[PDB]
Symmetry: C3
Subunit: 329 residues, 3 copies
C-alpha cells in the first residue's frame, strides 16, 4: 500500500537510525578482565591522652593489612594492652551479673567476654559478676574517640593503577594514559575540573565526591566504593577507550535496620616477654575500607548480530502495514 512506502521508510530509520547508533546492537559484547594496584601515602599525628604525641605512617602503621585490590585505612581505635592469658571479672551486664558462685557456671559465656569458671568474683567494690578466663584485663567498654585519632587521614592520598583486558578482542589498556608524562604524576592530584587524568586520589575527596564526609565517617568507620567503568567501542580508535571514576558509600548510616554499624575489627600484637610468658596488645580499629570495583563492556562491528537484527527488521515491517491500515481508516 501507499502506507507501505511510509513504513519501509520508518523501519529503515528505526533500525539503522534507532537500534544501531543508539542501542548499538551491531556489536558483540565482551566483559573486562581486571587487576588493580594501590599505593596510599601520607602520615598522621596523634596527641594521645597520656602517651603524648605520636606518628602513624599510613604506610606501615595504618594499613592492616596490605590487600590485593581493596584496602583499609585506619582512622580510629580502642587500644587495650598488657593483656595476658588469665582469669578475670566479666563486664557488668544483667546476663553476666551474679550474687554468688551459684550464678556462674556455658554457651553464653563462650559467646561473651571469655569462658566461664564457676567462681564468682567482684567486678568492683560496688558490684559483682561471673569470673571467666580470657585475655585480661578485658577491653574497656567505651564509644570510640571523637573526633577521630587519625583525622589527618582525610588528607592522605592514594595512587590507583588498573590494568584491564578484554580476552575476546585481544585488547588491553591501563588507566594511566600515554599522553601523561611521569613528571606530572610526581605531584598531580585527581580533580574532576582540572585534572581528570590524574590517577592519584585524595581520601577526603573520594569520600567527599561520594556525597559524604571523611570526618563524620572516620569516627565510626565505613566502606567507600571506588567504581571504575571501562566502556570502549573497539571499532573506534583505542585512544577513545577511557576509564570513568564514580564514588559511593556502601555501608548503611541508619542506626536502625542494621548491625555492626560502620566498619571496624580487632587485631593484636604479640610479644614474647623476657620472662618467657606471653602478652599481647589488643586493638579494635575503626576505619574506611576502600573497595575498587572495576567493570565494563566493549564491542567491535559484526555480521551475525547485524544480519540477525536486520532480518527481524524485515519481519517487523510486515506487521507495520496491518498497524497502519487499522489506524488509517
Amino acid at each position: 500500500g501507499t502506507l507501505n512506502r511510509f513504513t519501509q521508510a520508518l523501519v529503515i530509520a528505526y533500525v539503522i537510525g534507532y537500534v544501531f547508533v543508539y542501542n548499538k546492537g551491531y556489536q558483540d559484547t565482551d566483559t573486562v578482565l581486571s587487576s588493580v594496584t594501590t599505593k596510599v601515602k601520607g602520615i598522621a599525628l596523634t596527641k594521645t591522652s597520656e602517651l603524648g604525641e605520636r606518628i602513624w605512617d599510613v604506610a606501615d602503621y595504618i594499613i592492616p593489612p596490605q590487600e590485593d585490590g581493596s584496602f583499609f585505612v585506619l582512622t580510629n581505635m580502642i587500644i587495650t594492652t598488657n593483656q595476658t592469658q588469665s582469669k578475670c571479672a566479666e563486664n557488668p551486664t544483667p546476663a553476666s551479673t551474679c550474687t554468688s558462685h551459684r550464678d556462674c557456671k556455658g554457651f553464653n559465656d563462650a559467646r561473651g567476654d571469655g569462658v566461664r569458671t564457676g567462681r564468682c568474683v567482684s567486678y568492683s567494690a560496688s558490684v559483682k559478676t561471673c569470673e571467666v578466663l580470657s585475655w585480661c584485663p578485658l577491653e574497656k567498654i567505651v564509644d570510640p574517640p571523637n573526633p577521630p585519632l587519625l583525622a589527618d587521614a582525610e588528607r592522605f592520598t592514594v595512587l590507583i593503577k588498573n590494568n584491564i583486558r578484554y580476552p575476546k578482542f585481544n585488547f588491553n589498556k591501563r588507566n594511566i594514559l600515554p599522553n601523561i608524562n611521569s613528571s606530572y604524576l610526581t605531584h598531580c592530584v585527581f580533580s574532576r575540573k582540572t585534572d581528570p587524568d590524574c590517577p592519584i586520589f585524595r581520601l577526603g575527596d573520594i569520600v567527599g565526591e561520594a556525597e559524604e564526609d571523611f570526618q563524620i565517617m572516620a569516627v565510626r568507620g565505613g566502606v567507600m566504593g571506588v567504581q571504575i567503568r571501562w566502556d570502549c567501542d573497539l571499532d573506534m580508535p583505542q585512544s577513545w577507550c577511557v576509564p570513568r571514576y564514580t564514588f559511593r558509600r556502601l555501608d548503611n548510616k541508619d542506626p536502625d535496620n542494621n548491625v555492626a554499624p560502620g566498619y571496624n575489627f580487632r587485631f593484636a600484637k604479640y610479644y614474647k616477654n623476657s620472662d618467657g610468658t606471653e602478652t599481647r596488645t589488643l586493638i579494635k580499629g575503626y576505619g574506611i575500607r576502600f573497595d575498587v570495583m572495576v567493570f565494563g563492556q566493549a564491542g567491535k562491528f559484526n555480521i551475525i548480530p547485524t544480519l540477525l537484527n536486520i532480518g527481524a527488521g524485515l519481519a517487523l515491517l510486515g506487521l507495520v502495514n496491518v498497524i497502519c491500515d487499522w489506524i488509517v481508516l
Copy 2:
C-alpha cells in the same frame, strides 16, 4: 491454508506464551556489582597437652588474616616454637639419610627442610642425616590433632553483609531487608525454616547445610563456598528483589587424585629477644576458608529484544506451514 490459522495460533502462544513468561526474553540483562563484609564472633577453649587451658578469641587469635570478602577460620594446628636461625639435622628420609659427610652436599636441599651444609650429623643416637642451616629446631613431622583443637568453632557465628548494584539499571540493594528491625538482628541466627532473613549464619550450620560436617572437616581443613544469588526482575517491585543463599564444599575429600588435601598454611610470630637475637614461633594452621561468591542477573522490559524476537516469530511461522503440510497428508 486451514492449518495456517492453527499455526498462527501456535506461534502466538509459542512466543508470548512460551518464550516470554518462561524464558523472559523481552528483557535486557545486567550482571551484579558486588561488595561483601563479614564479622565472625565467638570464642573457643583448648586444653593443650602441657600448656593447660587456653582461650582463642576468633576475633583476633583465630582469623589470619582479616580478609576482603572471604575469610579463614582456624580450627587445628601444629605449633613449633623457640625457632632460630641455626644449623640442624634434617628429618629422617631416604633422600636425607647419609652415612658420612660425603653424602651431604643442593637443589633438593633447598626444596626440603633447609639449605644443605656439607657436614653430616646424627639425627639421633640411632640414625644420621644431612645437616642443614634453617629455622631450628625443625618442625616435628606428625599428623594434626584429632579431634580439632578449636572444635568450638562449629558454634561460632558469622554476620554477612552484602551491598550490590546493577550499573546499567542504576539500581542497588542490600541483603539486609528494611522490614527487619535492628533489635531482631541482636540475636537472630539464620535458618531455612524459621529465619530466612537472618544474615547471621552459624559456621556449623553453613558446613552442614552443604551436606558436610564441621567436625570431620575441621581436623584437616577445607574451603566452604557461600554462594549468594541475586535475581531481580526490575519491572517488578524492587521489594521482590531478594538474595538466595546456597552452600558448597569446594575442596576435594578424596585422598587419591589430589594434592595439599584439605586446607592449611604456615605463618609465624617474630620476637626480638632481650639478648638482641631473633626467635620465632612457627605455626602450621589447618582451618576452613569461607569464600563468599556473589552473582546474579536482572532485567527490565525493552523494545529492541522484544521486536527482535517477535520478528523472528513471524519468520518462524512461515516455515510452520510447510511442516504442517508435510505432516498432514
Copy 3:
C-alpha cells in the same frame, strides 16, 4: 527466480554452515563462578652483607601476607631496624634543607619523612635540615640491592587449585583432572611440551612463559597475571571441558609514563622491649605479586536462540534476491 534456488542454498549453508559451527549461536551463554587456591613451596638463601648467611622459608618468611586468590612473593628488600618513636633529621632535600630554626615550621612535612618540629638540626657535620618526629632512625635512601636478595625464588614452585561452576547449567569441575594420579602430582611440574596437566608451576617458568625474566624482574618487582580460561561446550562430554593457562606481565616497565615502578610496599615488625618501650623493624619489600585471573563461558543446545536465528535467516534470504538481481543483469 533461478537465483532464488542459489540463494536458498547459500543461506542454508550460511546459517547451519557458518553461524552455527563457527559462531555457535545455537547455545545460551553462562559465565564462570570461580574460586582458587595456591600453595607456594621453596626456600631461599641470602648471604647478607654483615648479618651472614640466612634462610627464608617462602612459606612463612616470604609471603606477606597469605592472600585469598592472588599472592605476593618477596624477592628484594631494604631493612631498617631498631626504629623508635623519636625526633630526628629529615633526608637531604632542597625542600627539607634549612639554614636555621626559621626555615622549619606543615602540610609537606606530614607528606614527607615525618611531622615537622620547628627546631632545625644538622643532618650531618656537612649539612643541615629540618628536624621532625617520626620513626627514627629514618630509612636510608638507596636503590634496592642488585642482584635480588631472594633470587632463589626464580626456582620456587606454586601449586594452583581452581574449582569453578556455571550456576545456570548446574555444572562444575576442577583444574585437576581425574585421569591424573596423586603419585604423579607428588613431583610433577607444569610444562607446555611434556606436562600440560601438571597444576604445579615454577615461578621462573611463569615469568618466563610471559616473555619476561624472573631475574630482571625480581630486583625492582612487578605483577604477573596468571590467566585461566574455562571454555566448555556442555553439549559435548564434560571430559572435553578443560582449562587453558596464559601468562602476562601487568605492570609497566617503561620508566617514563608511570609511577611506583615495579612492585613494593613497606610493613613492619613490632617488639615490646624488655624496657617496656616500643621498637619496630621497618621493611620495604620488592617482589612479584601473582594475580590468578579466572574466566570463561559455556553453552548447551537451545531452541529459543536457534529458532530466533533461523527466523532471521528466512528474512535475510528475502533481500538476497534483490542483491542477486541487481548484481546479475
